C-alpha cells in the first residue's frame, strides 16, 4: 500500500522555566519509531519501535546531533517569532514543524510535506513543488525571505526526495511484518434502548491498523451523516486503533440501519446490522 514518514517537532517556550523544550517524534504511517526530548535527563534519540533498534550507534548519534542542533535553532526561532509578532517576553509560545514524504503503493515518491505552525496556526509551508513557500502572514514572510535567501527550500527538497524516501523504504522493509501489515477491524453492533421509542445502535471497530478507517451508518441505504455520532479514532496502545459510530433509531426500525466499514485490512468492505 501507500506509506509515509513524518517527523513532528514541537518547540515550546516557557519564560521563567528554563529554555524552550524541543521534542521530535518520528512516524512511519501510524507507528511512532523514534523520540527526542530536550527535557530528558540525558537527551538522546531513543527508539520507540522494535524494528528501528537494529540501527547502529552511527544512526543514533546522527539523529541526536540533528535534534540537539535543532533544539538550539528552535530556541532562536522562538525568539525571532516573538519579535515578528511584537510579543512580550512573558508568554509561552510554540513552533511546530511537520514534515516528511509520501510513497505510493509502488514505493515511488508521491509528494513531500514540510509545514510549520506558530501557536497552532499555519505559519509557513513548503509548497508541493518543494521549491517555493506559502507564508501565512507578514511575520511568516520574514521567515520566507530569510529561507529564500538561504536557499532553504533546496535543502528541504533534497531531503524529501532523497534521504526521506530512502530511509522510509528502509524502515518499511525492516518493519515489513508490521508496517506493511494491515490489521482489519474486529466489528460488532451494540443495541441500547434510550427510551421506549428509541434505541442506540453503536457500530464498533476494534484492533485495526492503520488508523485510517471509514465507519458509517445508513438508514434504508442512505448515509446518516448528520444523525451519526462518530468518535475520534483512538489508539488502543497495542499499535491498533478503535472507533465507533452511533445512531439513535426508532424502536422497531433497527433493521433499516446498516453499518458500513471500510478499512485497508478488510478483504471486502463490511456491512453490519444489529443482530438481536
Amino acid at each position: 500500500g501507500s506509506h509515509s514518514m513524518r517527523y513532528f517537532y514541537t518547540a515550546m517556550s516557557r519564560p521563567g522555566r528554563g529554555e524552550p523544550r524541543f521534542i521530535a517524534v518520528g512516524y512511519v504511517d501510524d507507528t511512532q519509531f523514534v523520540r527526542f526530548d530536550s527535557d530528558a535527563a540525558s537527551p538522546r534519540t531513543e527508539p520507540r519501535a522494535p524494528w528501528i533498534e537494529q540501527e547502529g550507534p552511527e544512526y543514533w548519534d546522527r539523529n541526536t546531533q540533528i535534534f540537539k542542533t535543532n533544539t538550539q535553532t528552535y530556541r532562536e526561532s522562538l525568539r525571532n517569532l516573538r519579535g515578528y509578532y511584537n510579543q512580550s517576553e512573558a508568554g509561552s509560545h510554540i513552533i511546530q514543524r511537520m514534515y516528511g514524504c509520501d510513497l505510493g503503493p509502488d514505493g515511488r515518491l508521491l509528494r513531500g510535506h514540510d509545514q510549520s505552525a506558530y501557536d497552532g496556526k499555519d505559519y509557513i509551508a513548503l509548497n508541493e513543488d518543494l521549491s517555493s513557500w506559502t507564508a501565512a502572514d507578514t511575520a511568516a514572510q520574514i521567515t520566507q525571505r530569510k529561507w529564500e535567501a538561504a536557499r532553504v527550500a533546496e535543502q528541504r527538497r533534497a531531503y524529501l526526495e532523497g534521504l526521506c524516501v530512502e530511509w522510509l523504504r528502509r524502515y518499511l522493509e525492516n518493519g515489513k511484518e508490521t508496517l506493511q501489515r494491515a490489521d482489519p477491524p474486529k466489528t460488532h453492533v451494540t443495541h441500547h434502548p434510550v427510551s421506549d421509542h428509541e434505541a442506540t445502535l453503536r457500530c464498533w471497530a476494534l484492533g485495526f491498523y492503520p488508523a485510517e478507517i471509514t465507519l458509517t451508518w445508513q438508514r434504508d441505504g442512505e448515509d446518516q451523516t448528520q444523525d451519526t455520532e462518530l468518535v475520534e479514532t483512538r489508539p488502543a496502545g497495542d499499535r491498533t486503533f478503535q472507533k465507533w459510530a452511533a445512531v439513535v433509531v426508532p424502536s422497531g426500525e433497527e433493521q433499516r440501519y446498516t453499518c458500513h466499514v471500510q478499512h485497508e485490512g478488510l478483504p471486502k468492505p463490511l456491512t453490519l446490522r444489529w443482530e438481536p
Binding site: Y7, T73, Y74, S116, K146, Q155, Y159, C164
Partner: peptide, 13 residues
C-alpha cells in the same frame, strides 16, 4: 531519518 543538518548554518525561522 530526520532532515540532516545542512552544510553551513542551520537556518532559523
Amino acid at each position: 531519518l530526520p532532515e540532516p543538518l545542512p552544510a553551513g548554518q542551520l537556518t532559523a525561522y
